[PDB]
Design an enzyme around this catalytic site. Structure first.
Site, short mmCIF file in Angstrom:
data_model
loop_
_atom_site.label_atom_id
_atom_site.label_comp_id
_atom_site.label_asym_id
_atom_site.label_seq_id
_atom_site.Cartn_x
_atom_site.Cartn_y
_atom_site.Cartn_z
CG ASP A 15 -0.38 -0.12 2.50
OD1 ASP A 15 0.82 0.19 2.63
OD2 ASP A 15 -1.09 -0.50 3.45
NE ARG A 29 -1.12 2.86 4.21
CZ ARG A 29 -2.31 2.25 4.10
NH1 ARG A 29 -3.05 2.42 3.02
NH2 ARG A 29 -2.75 1.49 5.09
CG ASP A 34 -3.56 -1.90 6.60
OD1 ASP A 34 -2.51 -1.30 6.27
OD2 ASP A 34 -3.61 -2.68 7.58
CB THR A 35 -1.27 -4.30 1.78
OG1 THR A 35 -0.32 -3.25 1.99
CG2 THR A 35 -2.08 -4.01 0.55
CD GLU A 37 4.31 -2.83 8.48
OE1 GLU A 37 3.37 -2.00 8.61
OE2 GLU A 37 5.34 -2.58 7.82
NE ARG A 81 2.13 7.01 5.16
CZ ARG A 81 1.75 5.85 5.69
NH1 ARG A 81 2.37 4.73 5.36
NH2 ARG A 81 0.70 5.80 6.50
C1 LIG Z 1 -4.67 5.10 4.65
C2 LIG Z 1 -4.48 6.09 5.81
C3 LIG Z 1 -3.53 5.89 6.76
N1 LIG Z 1 -3.37 6.79 7.81
C4 LIG Z 1 -2.54 6.48 9.00
C5 LIG Z 1 -3.27 5.71 10.05
C6 LIG Z 1 -2.15 4.96 10.66
O1 LIG Z 1 -1.48 5.74 11.69
P1 LIG Z 1 -0.60 5.03 12.90
O2 LIG Z 1 0.68 4.87 12.21
O3 LIG Z 1 -0.70 6.02 13.97
O4 LIG Z 1 -1.29 3.77 13.23
C7 LIG Z 1 -1.19 4.63 9.54
C8 LIG Z 1 -1.55 3.36 8.78
O5 LIG Z 1 -0.65 3.19 7.67
P2 LIG Z 1 0.25 1.91 7.33
O6 LIG Z 1 -0.70 0.85 6.88
O7 LIG Z 1 1.20 2.30 6.23
O8 LIG Z 1 0.83 1.66 8.62
O9 LIG Z 1 -1.30 5.77 8.68
C9 LIG Z 1 -4.05 8.00 7.84
O10 LIG Z 1 -3.77 8.94 8.58
N2 LIG Z 1 -5.05 8.14 6.94
C10 LIG Z 1 -5.32 7.29 5.87
O11 LIG Z 1 -6.18 7.62 5.07
CA LIG Z 2 -0.22 -1.35 5.45
#
Ligand SMILES: Cc1cn([C@H]2C[C@H](OP(=O)(O)O)[C@@H](COP(=O)(O)O)O2)c(=O)[nH]c1=O
Ligand SMILES: [Ca+2]
EC number: 3.1.31.1
Length: 135
Positions: A15, A29, A34-35, A37, A81
């Protein structure tokens, strides 16, 4: 929503990827999904993580054209991102992953949810067919 050209720089995982957008390199992103980790130690290498990464990598590297489509709310998350719907030769990567059971519909923050129902119907189908994450 309006699609804008971008040039692939580097596929990172299922992702997240790096693209050249409006002249500058940026990591994107994928919205509403959500793919698994494959990096962060707090989650470890989750099942289907490497699979999801591969699916995305193949899809974006073999594309002639890549386009980013921001939604109607914020365009970046807290880590800087870009938040968008990414298309590879007109096909939405976000939906593609969900359809294969390689990602779950997640992080649905309004008003960045224009394609939520579309992605949801594809996730229901993947579940229905017990694909990957759903097997
Ligand atoms: C897709 C997405 C992710 N995020 C945030 C939530 C998560 O924060 P936290 O890192 O605090 O958990 C993280 C998830 O992304 P990853 O899947 O790359 O980890 O990025 C957003 O802020 N908004 C979005 O639309
Ligand atoms: Ca992810």
């Amino acid at each position: 929503l309006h699609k804008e050209p971008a040039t692939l720089i580097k596929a990172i995982d299922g992702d997240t990827c790096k693209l050249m957008y409006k002249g500058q390199p940026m990591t994107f992103r994928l919205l509403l999904v959500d793919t698994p980790e494959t990096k962060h130690p707090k989650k470890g290498v989750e099942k289907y993580g490497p699979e999801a990464s591969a699916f995305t990598k193949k899809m974006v590297e073999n594309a002639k054209k890549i386009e980013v489509e921001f939604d109607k709310g914020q365009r970046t998350d807290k880590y800087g991102r870009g938040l968008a719907y990414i298309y590879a030769d007109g096909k939405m990567v976000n939906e593609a992953l969900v359809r294969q059971g390689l990602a779950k519909v997640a992080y649905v923050y309004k008003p960045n949810n224009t394609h939520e129902q579309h992605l949801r119907k594809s996730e229901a189908q993947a579940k229905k067919e017990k694909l990957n994450i759903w097997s």
